[PDB]
Amino acid sequence: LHKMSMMAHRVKVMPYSTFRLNLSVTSPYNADFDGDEMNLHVPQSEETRAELSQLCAVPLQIVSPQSNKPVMGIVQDTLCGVRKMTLRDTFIEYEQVMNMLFWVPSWDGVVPQ
Amino acid sequence: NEDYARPEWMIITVLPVPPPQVRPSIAMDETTQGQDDLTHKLSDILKANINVQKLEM
Amino acid sequence: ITTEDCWTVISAFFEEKGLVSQQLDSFDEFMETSIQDLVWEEPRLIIRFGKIYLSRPTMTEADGTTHAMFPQEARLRNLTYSSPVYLDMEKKVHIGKVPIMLRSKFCSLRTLDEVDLYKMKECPYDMGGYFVINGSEKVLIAQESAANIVQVFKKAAPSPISHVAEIRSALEKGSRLISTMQIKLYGREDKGRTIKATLPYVKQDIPIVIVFRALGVVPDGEILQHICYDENDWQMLEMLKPCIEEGFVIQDKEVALDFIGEKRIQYAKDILQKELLPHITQEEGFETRKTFFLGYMVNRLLLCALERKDQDDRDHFGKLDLAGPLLANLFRILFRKLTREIYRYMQRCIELAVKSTTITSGLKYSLATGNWGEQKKAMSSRAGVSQVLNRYTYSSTLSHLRRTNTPIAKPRQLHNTHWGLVCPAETPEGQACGLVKNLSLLSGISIGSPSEPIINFLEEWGMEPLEDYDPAQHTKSTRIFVNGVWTGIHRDPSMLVSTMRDLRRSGAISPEVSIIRDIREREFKIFTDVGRVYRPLFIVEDDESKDNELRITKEHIRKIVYGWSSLVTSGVIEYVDGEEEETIMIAMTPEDLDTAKRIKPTFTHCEIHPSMILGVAASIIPFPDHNQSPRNTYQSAMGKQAMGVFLTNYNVRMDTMANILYYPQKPLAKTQAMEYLKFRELPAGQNAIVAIACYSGYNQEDSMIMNQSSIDRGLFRSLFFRSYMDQEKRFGISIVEEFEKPTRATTLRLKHGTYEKLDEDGLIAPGVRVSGDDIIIGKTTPDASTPLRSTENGIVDQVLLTTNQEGLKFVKVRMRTTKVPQIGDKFASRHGQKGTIGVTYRHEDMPFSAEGIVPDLIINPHAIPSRMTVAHLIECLLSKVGSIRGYEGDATPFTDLTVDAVSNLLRDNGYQSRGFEVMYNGHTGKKLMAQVFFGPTYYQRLRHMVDDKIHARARGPVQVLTRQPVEGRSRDGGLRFGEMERDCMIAHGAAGFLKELMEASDAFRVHVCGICGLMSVIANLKKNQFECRSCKNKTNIYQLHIPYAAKLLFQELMAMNIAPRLYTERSGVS
Amino acid sequence: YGVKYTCGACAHNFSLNKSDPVRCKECGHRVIYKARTKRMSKFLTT
């Protein structure tokens, strides 16, 4: 029932018998993992594909026209924790502040003072 | 419309019989029947036609 | 008698009735009695019938005598567990095969004991109650507005009618007409207000006055005599006035029966002695009686139109056709066609015949499908009655039998009247929800007693018969009803009452009958009826010349040659139907009636135990009194979908699909009720070492992490069976099929897979490891060989050859497979806490506690806050103690166990008083800044494993008519791109992709005519020749690309004579 | 050496072929399983 009930994704072949989708792209389809199933369609023309990537790419969909506001945020664990990590009381030492910077792929390669 | 549909043709004289892809048959291997629904009321009609004429001659 | 006592009473209950009482009890009632009364009524033919014989199971097959049959066989051979029927016919005789009910009376099982059964291969634990038609186990489903009762309804401002009273009538035994009585009341609450009523077969309506004179009452005031019972009630009487004027034109019984259109007058009578309020009796000399009713009715009407009595409550539950009854209304329909069949042989003999196949085959049809009403050009029946008994789990089967239906916003509701008789939680989500009810543990259905032994017992203890009544000499005369008939009134009743009630308690008027005294209206209800749900209660009676008390005492208890039959034959317990319930006062806790427990707030009866208002489903749910009710309702469904053991004989069963959990486990916490659900011996799951925490972030959104390591040690592994089956069809014209290992040989008609794993008998051996598509069976037709379902594979587990009634070769094959839990399979606890696997880590990777102990499962803390299911949290704690203490942890409903208590017990053992434990992150070993709710919780492994769903297609089997793909993943189908999916793409402005209905489905090249825009063209694609004679063309022709479904749309329209011309150029412009 | 079909109760190795009836060397009970294979089956310990 949404323009977002269908979105174009980058394919990632992986093992195990299941479609593995990102969490933040959860509420658009409105799915959960208690058994929910998903349909997948495969473009076939060179343009068909393009039409799928230039207008239906998940990134283009982030701001929903129905309520002129985004429609995908940070859910559960990531949200809940992002809160903790923020409090003035939350401190991290070098050993971890490093393994943390490493996980950010775009990291400039510079540890902040 | 005098060209495409004249009042009279709302009554049928000669009946258009649709072909197989329309009323396909489904055989159970080889030596077993299997005929579509329409491929019957065509025959039911056909038979109700035969007898009629054989009462008018 | 304390609380812990009432349990032995309940134990006492099932020791004697057993979970499926209802089904059996109601069956025997059809065989034993009913069946007779049915054959003996409108029998005798211008040749009569007498007693009928009902033998035990038999198998009349050509090439053998008549083998005395048994359950477990008919099962394997797909037969029919039915026996013969004989009738002492008068001028001994065979008439049909009746399908018996397993575990009943004619079913040999009814006697055999423990050891006795193990030999018949029949699992002891199977409580039976089902039929076995053509193989598969069929379960008759209970079919639930009562009859013969007066109702008054107000009819909307827009209507010529003000109010109206109705009464649906039908003979409780004999044909059973479905014609209702309408006692209307024209003239809205203003206009200058008549009363007319509707009769069966009469075109228009008649003004009540005439209905009376036509009855046998000719003068006014003698008419008002019947309607109103108080000459000083001018209002009501006033109302009647205008009515009297209506009929003032017909002054006697002659004309009375006339105006109802010598020929006509005679028919008038008829519709009054056989159609008019036909219950009561359709005899003759009772005109009087019906008159007092039509009077009691016209009364009830006004009693409301004058704001003294509300409009009748349509959903007052107090106002179930089990198996036994169903066969009844069914049999009749049959035997009656046999009756008038035997009439034709007798109408040809110008000087054996009884085809006892209409009662055998007729019965089978119904029971087989689920369509009661015959067959023929009569689909105008009901499908559902009789289904395919569940066998996923034990608690699944129980549930299925204790099920109720209800032909189609208010009914679905959980009414008050539902207390005790039906389970509040167990009921299907979506679609039909509330139209399908399950019985509580204690509930039972009435069966059908006799009226007279109580009609008599009455008009000889104070019941001055209705026949001769005088409203004024007998003012406040308490009127009495019997099964909906008015058998006279009674003077001082207070005693008539506490005499019948003393009569039942000694057991001289079946404990099943209902007697309700409504002082607040002065009436006496008598019910023998068949289909009244009732529950049992302790009797209170202030019978204590030593105080203020339950008739039952701690001496009766410890005394439990003392069944439940005695607990009733001593007036210590009573069977209260929903109606009688209305006039009693029930005490909850027998006894009673701390800053931890739940705050707790004339008696005639006490509650055996509140935790008995639950049915099979909830009975397995721990602390259902601690979760959000809507959740309990869910688990109420998932249970019927977990794994376990559905019987023990399973190893000798040839049923398609069946799953057994490698290693079961009775729960660490249980319901006292489970004890009767044999649950401890047939668990639906295992006790997993849960751990509610966040980790990799793979236990997110109801997906759970499962410890691979222990998945290997066999945790939650399950066997999977399957049984493909085939026959060797023949023809009265000796042309038989074959079971061989075919190849070549002039035909080709063969499969793709291999036949090599086929010994020459056309079968595999039980050792063979089959897979992909490998031909499992080999049959031929002078190929008809069976292939292992494409998604499957495993190993053959048991092959078997056998005869058919028709001496044909019957062969079923069973394949086994061990199914391992995988990163996707679904699981769940007993709290609607369903979730699937997201990943699987091992011991190292797993988070842990100093002790070593590590979780088997890691569910997310997020599935708790809004689900509200807390009992879940409790079962864990409790079970973490029962784990350490070895003592069984009770989770049972409303008891005296608290969170504060258990927590103290857990502190005695060593761990945090709340469960939480320290844990060190399996990757680094550093402690977790937080603590976790680590504790053993029961988890059911619901069916629904990924690899049974995963499906992908690209150009596969195409349909025939349409030419589009085919449906379903099993037949290699393709997912539909239905409307809604269309829409979206259109929203995206994804023009081309959507257009790309063609490439992924239909598409097709048709050849149109440039002139008559049709698909005529005879395009012989080679020699180019195109043509289209009739339009005689070979020059102007076009080719187009449209969805074959559409090409078809057109061919179709044409054969209906409409002409869809297809033109390649616009001529109309714009 | 050798076996064809067995009986559901009195597990007594039988052996037949077309038309030779489908019963047992006694018990009428016309069931019968098709005894294991000769070719050994190999399993994995996981």
Next chain:
Amino acid sequence: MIIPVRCFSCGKVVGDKWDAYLRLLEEGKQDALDELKLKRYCCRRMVLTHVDLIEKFLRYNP
């Protein structure tokens, strides 16, 4: 349905311990687990929850 060799949860063997347990009950009339050496609940629950069906299965004929 037979006893489970080794506990799922931690791994400690537990096949042998079946008869020892089902015995320390019938006779010594007894805690049993504790002496059988089954400490932490993971393995504890293993034994204390097994419902030996095999027995009933064994009651079947051929």
Next chain:
Amino acid sequence: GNLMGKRVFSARTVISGDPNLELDQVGVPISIAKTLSYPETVTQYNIHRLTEYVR
């Protein structure tokens, strides 16, 4: 039933989220990828790779 909407290079199974997949990705089971194809015309830019994929 057949025109305004038909069954159609498609697949469907069970979802479970993965916290290590770019927002726009979608992990597809090898099994499925080995089933669904894509008609790519031979071109002197991809001949080399295609002749490999084909072998």
Next chain:
Amino acid sequence: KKTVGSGGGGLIHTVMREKGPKICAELFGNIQKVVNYWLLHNGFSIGIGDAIADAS
């Protein structure tokens, strides 16, 4: 939720508008990867204890 939810002021709503579909789409994974990882180590749970009220 207020600063990183599917909300109006939403840091997301802003990063989309200011940087583009792409940049913002990546933003998720990062904010994620860092946090999810962190949580993996700081741990978090819930138990009956979270639902009990003070003695008085």
Next chain:
Amino acid sequence: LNIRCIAKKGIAKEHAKWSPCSAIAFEYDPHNKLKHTDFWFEVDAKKEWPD
């Protein structure tokens, strides 16, 4: 019942049927001095949390 088993090397990674471990205790700094934890509690951590 006739079998014939073949045993092989292998490890717990390949399968649990290998690892000879089976539960292992691990603790450090029982008195939270390093503060690698934040004790949950209703009133007193120390009294409510087993030493």
Next chain:
Amino acid sequence: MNTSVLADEFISHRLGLIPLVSEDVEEMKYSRDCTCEDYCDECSVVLELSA
């Protein structure tokens, strides 16, 4: 041969778990490295079981 009420692979599992000796386990080779088609004394231990 196997007339037990347990299935083939159910027992198969069982034996996978039965603990075998592994003292001089280090002076044996992984079937994967041993140059023998399938197995042998130099990399495996065969067992019998009749009941």
